[PDB]
Paper text:
Contractile bacteriophages of the family Myoviridae (i.e. T4), R-type pyocins and the type VI secretion system (T6SS) of Gram-negative bacteria are evolutionarily related nano-scale injection machines that puncture target cell membranes using a shared contraction mechanism. [name] subunits are enigmatic as they possess a conserved N-terminal region of unknown function, previously identified as ImpA_N (PFAM: PF0681226), whereas sequences located C-terminal to this region are highly divergent. Consistent with this, phylogenetic analysis has suggested that the [name] family can be subdivided into three clades (TssA1, TssA2 and TssA3). The structural studies presented here show that TssA1B, TssA2A and TssA2B possess structurally diverse CTDs that lead to distinct overall architectures for their respective complexes.
We also provide the structure of an [name]-[name] TssA2A construct, demonstrating that 10 subunits assemble into a complex with distinct five-fold symmetry rather than the six-fold symmetry seen in EAEC TssA2B. The structure of crystals of an Ah His6.TssA2A [name]-[name] construct (R232-K478) was successfully determined to 3.13 Å through molecular replacement using the coordinates of the Ah TssA2A [name] dimer as a search model. This identified the position of five dimers of the TssA2A [name] domain (R232 to L374, helices α1–α7) in the asymmetric unit, which did not appear to be arranged with any obvious symmetry with respect to each other. In the assembled TssA2A [name] decamer two distinct two-fold interfaces can be identified. In the first, a two-fold related interface (shown by PISA32 to be 530 Å2) is formed primarily through interactions between residues from the extended loop linking α11 and α12 and the N-terminal end of α10 and their symmetry-related partners. In the second, more extensive interface (950 Å2), the WEP-mediated dimers assemble around the five-fold axis through interactions between the surface of helices α9, α10 and α11 and their two-fold related symmetry mates to form a mixed interface of hydrophobic/hydrophilic contacts. However, restrictions imposed by the maximum length of the absent linker residues and the relative orientations of the [name] and [name] domains allowed the unambiguous assignment of the [name] domains to their corresponding [name] (i.e. in the same polypeptide chain).
Numbering used by the authors:
A (entry chain C): 230 to 376, 383 to 474
B (entry chain A): 229 to 375, 388 to 474
C (entry chain D): 344 to 375, 388 to 474
Amino acid sequence: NDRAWRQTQLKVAELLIERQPEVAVGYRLRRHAVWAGITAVPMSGAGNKTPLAPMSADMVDEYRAAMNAPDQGLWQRIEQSLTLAPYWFEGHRLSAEVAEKLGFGAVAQAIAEELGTFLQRLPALRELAFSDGSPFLSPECSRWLQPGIGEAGLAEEVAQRHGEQGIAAALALLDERIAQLKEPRDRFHALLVQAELLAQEGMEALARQHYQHLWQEASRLGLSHWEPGLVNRLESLAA
Amino acid sequence: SNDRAWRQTQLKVAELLIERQPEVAVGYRLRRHAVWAGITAVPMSGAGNKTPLAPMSADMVDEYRAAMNAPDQGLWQRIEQSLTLAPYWFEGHRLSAEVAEKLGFGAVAQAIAEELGTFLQRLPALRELAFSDGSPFLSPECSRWLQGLAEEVAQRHGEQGIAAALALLDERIAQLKEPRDRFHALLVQAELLAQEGMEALARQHYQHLWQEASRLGLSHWEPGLVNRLESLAA
Amino acid sequence: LGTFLQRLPALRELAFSDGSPFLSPECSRWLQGLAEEVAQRHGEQGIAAALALLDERIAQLKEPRDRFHALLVQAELLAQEGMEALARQHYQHLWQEASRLGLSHWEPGLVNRLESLAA
């Protein structure tokens, strides 16, 4: 009766979450319960597609709707579903986004550590798709998962002002700083902030585009033979 | 000093062409040429684009704003005669069009607008300047009066705030395969950052844009764009 | 264990009845500005210690930009000591690895000083 034991895990996870919903372990115990019996991916064929239809758009949209005014109640129905919709990897991205907005960084964190785990157990999943052809793992769902001294001296000096006033002022500051810089290295750092800043406001395409021009502008300057760590991240970012 | 009489001449005839027919454009249109043709290049800006020119006495303007609900032909004449002595006071040219739009002179307002639009397109440097007391040449509600990407985006920048625009710019890039498209998209991002008031951040974006064009060899292919980009980085 | 320690910062500092710490400095490792540091080590032990310390630092410094300061350290050290000759020598083989790596197009202060602080 793996079935019954699996109940029990969930039961304990329900309760753990109920008692402490800012604390990972319950979330973790559930993922397990849900992805226990799974030993090898579902039978696929034409275009990697699987005989399993995706999450009811209606349903997904409705969830994406609530996001602006999210509560501890939303988060529960999301989760209820990804307990019944094993492979819905996009919902594990929501759960993480929701949780992060409700104030639970650590749980978001965990939701993902545990997913990345599942994908290393059976990576065939990173390629599979639902009978409608849509991917088990989107590209925005996969960038999610993949992981200076004076650089952070401003970046942290700014992401602070990005919290007191909004993005508008964040940039406003970034500007007034740059006007008083001589060294290109610094000015390149600034522009680098601008990108990171847009990343946190939800500008995945506009941010990435700055990384592209920052990686090449660096590689062009031959920083692979001096300060290659900078260049190596820049490369990872621009994906 | 002889083109003094020539300008006055152009005005008298304007005065007349309107007296005889207040519902017909040309009169008003000539009045413009009397005032803006002598203007060949913009005035010397200083501390925050303040040009050493005084503005329209706010009291004298309040008065015109007062009268706006109950508008007569005598009001309209004083707006216009004022906007004859304060060449760059573009708010007057909105007030004239509003006066004219209520008084049923629908194609005159249109004209009053097209003619400004013309002048601004000629010396676009004016859009950003302002008077000694920092009151804008092209004012807030006046640029709204005269309004595919920088088209659609700076449209969204005025309606919603800046973030909504940046938000859109983002979802446009999402589909812009060819580097030309992308290059423009980042070019907009820059314009928009100057339109929000961070000059040096846009300058820094323009510097890397021209140096990127120059290196792609666009000077022998879209030299217009590369020579615009060049000055914007001064 | 990292979290449990992060939930209560005090548990680290504590010790049992017998004064034996809850968390050893051995266990804390299981979980967890050079000229500033070492230019004072020169006032204490002699110049010979200032170099012995500089050695253990460069043991791990995978970024050559760090190292260039680490050799810029070895330069500063000898310069202040009185050895003005072996000094300028070191500031030449540094100034030229700059013009080589293209540092007039990046961090060009470093350069402009390095030249008049060598010729």
